[PDB]
Coordinates of C-alpha atoms and ligand atoms in Angstrom, one line a residue:
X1 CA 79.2 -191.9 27.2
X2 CA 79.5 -187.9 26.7
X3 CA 82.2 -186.2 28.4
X4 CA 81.6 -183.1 26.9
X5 CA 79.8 -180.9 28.9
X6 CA 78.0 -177.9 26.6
X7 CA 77.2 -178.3 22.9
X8 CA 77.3 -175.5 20.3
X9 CA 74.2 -175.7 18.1
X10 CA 73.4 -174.3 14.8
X11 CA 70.7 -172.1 13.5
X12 CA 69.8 -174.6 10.7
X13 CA 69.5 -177.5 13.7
X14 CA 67.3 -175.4 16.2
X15 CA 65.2 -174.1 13.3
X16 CA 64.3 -177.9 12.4
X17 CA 63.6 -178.9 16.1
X18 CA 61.0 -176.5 16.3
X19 CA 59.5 -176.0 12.7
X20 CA 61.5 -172.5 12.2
X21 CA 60.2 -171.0 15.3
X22 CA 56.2 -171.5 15.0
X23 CA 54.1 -170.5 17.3
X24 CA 53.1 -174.0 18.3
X25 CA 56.8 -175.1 19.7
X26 CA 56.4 -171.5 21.9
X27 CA 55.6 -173.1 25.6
X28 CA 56.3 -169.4 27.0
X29 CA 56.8 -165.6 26.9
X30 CA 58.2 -164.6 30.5
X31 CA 60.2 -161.8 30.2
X32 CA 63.4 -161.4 28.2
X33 CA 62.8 -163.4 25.5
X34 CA 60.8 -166.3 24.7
X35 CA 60.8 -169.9 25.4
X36 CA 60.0 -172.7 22.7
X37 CA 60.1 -176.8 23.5
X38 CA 62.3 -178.8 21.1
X39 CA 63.8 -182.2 21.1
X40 CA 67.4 -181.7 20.6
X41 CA 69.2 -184.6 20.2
X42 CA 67.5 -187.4 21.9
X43 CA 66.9 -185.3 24.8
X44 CA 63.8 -182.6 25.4
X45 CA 64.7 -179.4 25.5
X46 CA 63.4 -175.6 26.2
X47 CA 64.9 -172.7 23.8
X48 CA 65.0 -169.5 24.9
X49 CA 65.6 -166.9 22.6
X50 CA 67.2 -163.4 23.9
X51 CA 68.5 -160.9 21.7
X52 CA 71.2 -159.7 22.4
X53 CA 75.1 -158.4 20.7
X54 CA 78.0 -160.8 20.5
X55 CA 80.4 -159.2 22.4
X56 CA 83.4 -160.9 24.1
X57 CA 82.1 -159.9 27.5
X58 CA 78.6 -160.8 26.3
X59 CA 80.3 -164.0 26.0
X60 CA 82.6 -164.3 29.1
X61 CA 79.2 -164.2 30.8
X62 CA 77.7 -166.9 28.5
X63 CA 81.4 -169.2 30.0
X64 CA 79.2 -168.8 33.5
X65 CA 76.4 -170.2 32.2
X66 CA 77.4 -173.4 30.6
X67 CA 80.8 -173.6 33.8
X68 CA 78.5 -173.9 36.3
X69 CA 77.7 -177.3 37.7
X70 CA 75.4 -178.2 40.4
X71 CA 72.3 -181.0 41.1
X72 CA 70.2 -178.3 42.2
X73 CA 70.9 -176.1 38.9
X74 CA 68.8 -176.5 35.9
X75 CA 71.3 -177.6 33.4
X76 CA 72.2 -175.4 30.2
X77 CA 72.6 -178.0 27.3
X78 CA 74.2 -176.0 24.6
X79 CA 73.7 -172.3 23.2
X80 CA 73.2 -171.2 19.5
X81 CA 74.9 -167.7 18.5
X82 CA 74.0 -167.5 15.0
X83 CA 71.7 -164.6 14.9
X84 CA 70.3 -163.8 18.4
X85 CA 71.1 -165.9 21.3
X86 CA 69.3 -169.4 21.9
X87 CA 69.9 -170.9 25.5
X88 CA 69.1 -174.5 25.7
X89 CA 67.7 -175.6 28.7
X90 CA 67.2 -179.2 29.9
X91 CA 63.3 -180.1 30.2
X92 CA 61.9 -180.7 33.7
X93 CA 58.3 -182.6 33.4
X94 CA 56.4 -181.2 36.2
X95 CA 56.2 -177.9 36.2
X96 CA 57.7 -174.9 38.9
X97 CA 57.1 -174.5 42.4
X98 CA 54.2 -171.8 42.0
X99 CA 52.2 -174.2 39.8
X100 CA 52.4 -176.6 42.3
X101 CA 51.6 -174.4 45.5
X102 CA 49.4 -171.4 43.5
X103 CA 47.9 -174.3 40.9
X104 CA 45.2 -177.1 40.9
X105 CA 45.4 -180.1 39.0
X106 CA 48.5 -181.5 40.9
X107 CA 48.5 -183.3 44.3
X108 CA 48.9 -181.3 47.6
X109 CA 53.2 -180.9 48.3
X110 CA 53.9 -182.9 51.0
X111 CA 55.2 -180.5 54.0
X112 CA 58.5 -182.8 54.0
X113 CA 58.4 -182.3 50.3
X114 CA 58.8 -178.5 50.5
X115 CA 61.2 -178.6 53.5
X116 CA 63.0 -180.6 50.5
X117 CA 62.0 -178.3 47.4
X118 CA 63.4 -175.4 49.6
X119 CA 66.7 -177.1 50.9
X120 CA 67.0 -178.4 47.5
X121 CA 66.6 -174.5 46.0
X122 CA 69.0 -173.0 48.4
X123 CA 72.1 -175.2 47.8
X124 CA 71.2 -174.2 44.4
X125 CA 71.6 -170.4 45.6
X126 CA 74.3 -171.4 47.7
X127 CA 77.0 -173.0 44.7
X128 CA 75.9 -169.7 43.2
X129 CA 76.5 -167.0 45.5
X130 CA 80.1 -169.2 46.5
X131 CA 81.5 -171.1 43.6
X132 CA 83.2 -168.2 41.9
X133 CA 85.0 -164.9 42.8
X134 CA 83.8 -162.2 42.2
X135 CA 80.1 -163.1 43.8
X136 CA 77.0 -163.9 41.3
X137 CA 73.7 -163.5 41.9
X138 CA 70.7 -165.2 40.4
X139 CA 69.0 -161.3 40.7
X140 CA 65.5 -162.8 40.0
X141 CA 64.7 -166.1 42.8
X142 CA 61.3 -166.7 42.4
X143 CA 58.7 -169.8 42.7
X144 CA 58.3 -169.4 39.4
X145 CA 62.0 -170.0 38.8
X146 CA 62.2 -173.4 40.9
X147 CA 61.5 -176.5 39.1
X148 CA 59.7 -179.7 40.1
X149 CA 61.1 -183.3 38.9
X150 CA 58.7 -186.5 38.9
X151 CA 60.9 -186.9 42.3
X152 CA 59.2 -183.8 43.8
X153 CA 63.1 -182.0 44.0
X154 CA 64.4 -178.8 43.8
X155 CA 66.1 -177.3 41.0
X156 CA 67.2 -172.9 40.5
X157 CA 65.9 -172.1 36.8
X158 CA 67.1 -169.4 35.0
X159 CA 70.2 -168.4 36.3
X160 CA 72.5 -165.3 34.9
X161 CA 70.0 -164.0 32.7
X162 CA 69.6 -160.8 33.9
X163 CA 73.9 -160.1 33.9
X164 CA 73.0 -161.5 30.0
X165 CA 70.5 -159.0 29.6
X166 CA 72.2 -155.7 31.3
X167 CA 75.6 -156.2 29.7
X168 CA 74.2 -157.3 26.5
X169 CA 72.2 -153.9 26.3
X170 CA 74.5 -151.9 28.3
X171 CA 60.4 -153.4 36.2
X172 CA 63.6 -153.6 34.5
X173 CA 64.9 -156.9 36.6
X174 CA 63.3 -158.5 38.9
X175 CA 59.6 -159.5 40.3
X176 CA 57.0 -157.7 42.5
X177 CA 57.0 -159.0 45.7
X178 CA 60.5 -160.6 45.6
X179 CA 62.5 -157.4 45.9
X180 CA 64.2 -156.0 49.1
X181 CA 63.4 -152.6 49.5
X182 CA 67.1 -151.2 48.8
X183 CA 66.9 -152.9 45.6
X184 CA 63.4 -152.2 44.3
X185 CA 63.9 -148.4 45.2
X186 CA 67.5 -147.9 45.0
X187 CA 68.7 -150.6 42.7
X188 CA 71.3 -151.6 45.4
X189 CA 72.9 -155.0 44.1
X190 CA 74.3 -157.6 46.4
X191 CA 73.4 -161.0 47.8
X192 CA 70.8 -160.3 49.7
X193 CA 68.6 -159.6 46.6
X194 CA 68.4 -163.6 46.6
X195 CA 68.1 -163.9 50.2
X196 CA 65.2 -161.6 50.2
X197 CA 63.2 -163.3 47.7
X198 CA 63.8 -166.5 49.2
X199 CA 62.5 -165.7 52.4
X200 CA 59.2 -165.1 50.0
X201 CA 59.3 -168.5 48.6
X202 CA 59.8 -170.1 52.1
X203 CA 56.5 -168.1 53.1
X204 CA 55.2 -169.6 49.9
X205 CA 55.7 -172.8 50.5
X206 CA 53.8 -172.1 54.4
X207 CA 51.2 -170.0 53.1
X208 CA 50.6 -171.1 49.1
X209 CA 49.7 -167.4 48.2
X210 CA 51.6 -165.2 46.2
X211 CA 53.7 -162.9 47.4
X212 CA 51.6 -160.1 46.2
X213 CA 48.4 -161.0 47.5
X214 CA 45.3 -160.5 45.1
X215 CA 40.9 -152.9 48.9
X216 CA 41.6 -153.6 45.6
X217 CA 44.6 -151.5 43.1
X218 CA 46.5 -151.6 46.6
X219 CA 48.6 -154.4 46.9
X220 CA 49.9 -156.2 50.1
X221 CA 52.9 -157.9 50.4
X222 CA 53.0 -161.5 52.1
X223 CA 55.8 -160.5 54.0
X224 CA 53.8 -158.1 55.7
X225 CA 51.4 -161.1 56.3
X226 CA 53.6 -162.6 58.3
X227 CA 54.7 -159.5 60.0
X228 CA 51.2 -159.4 60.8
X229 CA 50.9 -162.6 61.9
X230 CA 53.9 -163.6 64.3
X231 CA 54.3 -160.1 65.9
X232 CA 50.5 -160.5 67.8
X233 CA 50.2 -161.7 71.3
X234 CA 49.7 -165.5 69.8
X235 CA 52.3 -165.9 67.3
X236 CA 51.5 -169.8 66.7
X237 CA 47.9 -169.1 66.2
X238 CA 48.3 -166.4 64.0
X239 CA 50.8 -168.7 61.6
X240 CA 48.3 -171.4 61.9
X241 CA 45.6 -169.2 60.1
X242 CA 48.4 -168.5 57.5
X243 CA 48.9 -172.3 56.6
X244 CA 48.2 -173.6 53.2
X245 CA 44.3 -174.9 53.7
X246 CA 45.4 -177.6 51.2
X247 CA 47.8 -179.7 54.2
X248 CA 45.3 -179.1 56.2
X249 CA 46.7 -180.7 59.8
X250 CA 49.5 -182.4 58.5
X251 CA 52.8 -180.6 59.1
X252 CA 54.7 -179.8 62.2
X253 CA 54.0 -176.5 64.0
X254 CA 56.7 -176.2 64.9
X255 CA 59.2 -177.2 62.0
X256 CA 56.6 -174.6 59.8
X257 CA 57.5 -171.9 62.9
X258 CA 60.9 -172.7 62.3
X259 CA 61.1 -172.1 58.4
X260 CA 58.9 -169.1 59.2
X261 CA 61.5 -167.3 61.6
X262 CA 64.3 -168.2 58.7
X263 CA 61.9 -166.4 56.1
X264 CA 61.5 -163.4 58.8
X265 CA 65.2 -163.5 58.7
X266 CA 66.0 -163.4 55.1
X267 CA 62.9 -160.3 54.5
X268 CA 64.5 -158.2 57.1
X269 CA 64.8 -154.2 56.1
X270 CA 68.3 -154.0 56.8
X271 CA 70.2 -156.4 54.0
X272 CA 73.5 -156.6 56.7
X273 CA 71.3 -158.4 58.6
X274 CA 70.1 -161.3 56.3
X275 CA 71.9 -164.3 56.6
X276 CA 74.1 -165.9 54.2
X277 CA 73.0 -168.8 52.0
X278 CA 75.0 -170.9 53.4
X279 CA 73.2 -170.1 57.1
X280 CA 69.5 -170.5 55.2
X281 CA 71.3 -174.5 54.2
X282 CA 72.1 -175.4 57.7
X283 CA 69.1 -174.0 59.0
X284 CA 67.1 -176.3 56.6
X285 CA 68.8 -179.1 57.4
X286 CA 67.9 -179.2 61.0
X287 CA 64.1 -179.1 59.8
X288 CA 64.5 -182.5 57.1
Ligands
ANP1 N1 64.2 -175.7 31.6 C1 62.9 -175.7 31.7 N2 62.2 -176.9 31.7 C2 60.9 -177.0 31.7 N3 60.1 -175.9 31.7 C3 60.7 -174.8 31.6 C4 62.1 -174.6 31.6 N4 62.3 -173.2 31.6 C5 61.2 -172.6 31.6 N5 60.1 -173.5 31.6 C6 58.7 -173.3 31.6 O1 58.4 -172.3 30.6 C7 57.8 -171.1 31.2 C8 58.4 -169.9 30.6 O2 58.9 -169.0 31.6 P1 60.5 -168.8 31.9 O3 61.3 -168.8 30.6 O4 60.8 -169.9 33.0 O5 60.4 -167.3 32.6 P2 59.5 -166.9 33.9 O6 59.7 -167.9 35.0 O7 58.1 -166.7 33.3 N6 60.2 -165.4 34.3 P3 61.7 -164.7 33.6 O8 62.8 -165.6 34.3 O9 61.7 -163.3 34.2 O10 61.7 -164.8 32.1 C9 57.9 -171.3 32.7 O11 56.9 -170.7 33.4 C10 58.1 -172.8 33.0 O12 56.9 -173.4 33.2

């Protein structure tokens, strides 16, 4: 079969795949760039165009993207230079975690399936934050950034494109609700950004609302929903109210009480005291 592991593509060949760029091959607009579906030999495909200079350090950080290797990674196909920059993306069926959780139309998650989804998502974090020296960092974890297979797993979308963006033009990065509070306010970079936001998408996966929580023009974080709800006098029944009405009965209490004190942990004020990734993995494990 193939042994190669990234392929190069041309202007001329992504142009074809998607009828020069029309509008009806553009699946999405979400932020630095946009996103068209093509089918790329024999395999479908997701092009996201970013635009963006050609420099060499523009393209050590492009060697990142198409070096890394993991299961839990949503693989990079190929690249196209010509022009602006076109990342090619393997497709993923099913959609991401928050259409799942936030949408209707699919079938209620399992609660084993998102124990899974979320120890499937954080060895994804984990091979990031550990396979390389100096540290990367995904800098924008989100639900909307996991990916569901037909197999209900786990896979990090989207990875490096906000080092892409910043040196390549050297909210600007990142999503409400997912930001620490020495990041969103200082811009503070380190680890714990990804920690942070996913201790959100573990209380996403609990609660199925987003983490800002639609009186009104004020917004409310959900992790101050579960500050409010496991610092009270009961703090089982107040993270039984919190459940996603869609499981209904079916889940542990206390395997979603566990996952909850690991997403207390991870949204703590004080980055120094979030755990590792690699922590968040064990601590998963023990609940599949
Ligand atoms: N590799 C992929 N396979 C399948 N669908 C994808 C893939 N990448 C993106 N999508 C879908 O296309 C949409 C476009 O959004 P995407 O390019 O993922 O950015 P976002 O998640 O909206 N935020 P940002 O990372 O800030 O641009 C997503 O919401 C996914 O549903």
């Amino acid at each position: 079969i193939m042994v190669a592991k990234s392929t190069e593509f041309t202007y001329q060949e992504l142009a074809k795949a998607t009828n020069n760029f029309s509008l009806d091959n553009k699946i999405g607009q979400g932020g630095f760039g946009a996103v068209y579906y093509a089918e790329l030999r024999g395999e479908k495909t997701a092009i996201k165009k970013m635009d963006v200079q050609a420099s060499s350090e523009f393209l050590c950080e492009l060697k990142v993207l198409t070096h890394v290797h993991h299961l839990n990674l949503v693989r990079l196909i190929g690249y196209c230079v010509e022009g602006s920059l076109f990342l090619v993306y393997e497709h993923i069926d099913n959609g991401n975690l928050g259409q799942y959780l936030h949408g209707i139309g699919t079938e209620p998650l399992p609660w084993s399936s998102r124990v899974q989804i979320a120890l499937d998502s954080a060895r994804g974090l984990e091979y990031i934050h550990e396979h390389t020296v100096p540290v990367y960092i995904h800098r924008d974890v989100k639900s909307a950034n996991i990916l569901i297979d037909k197999n209900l797993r786990g896979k990090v979308a989207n990875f490096g494109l906000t080092k892409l963006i910043e040196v390549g033009n050297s909210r600007l990065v990142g999503t409400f609700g997912y930001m620490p509070p020495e990041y969103a306010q200082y811009g503070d970079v380190s680890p714990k950004i990804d920690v942070y936001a996913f201790g959100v998408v573990l209380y996403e996966l609990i609660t199925a609302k987003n983490a800002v929580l639609k009186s009104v023009a004020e917004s409310k974080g959900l992790v101050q929903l579960f500050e409010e709800a496991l610092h009270r006098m009961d703090p089982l029944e107040g993270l039984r109210k919190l459940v996603d009405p869609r499981l209904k009965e079916n889940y542990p209490i206390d395997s979603v009480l566990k996952m909850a004190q690991l997403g207390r942990a991870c949204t703590r004020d004080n980055p120094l005291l979030r755990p590792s990734m690699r922590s968040i993995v064990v601590a998963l494990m023990t609940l599949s």
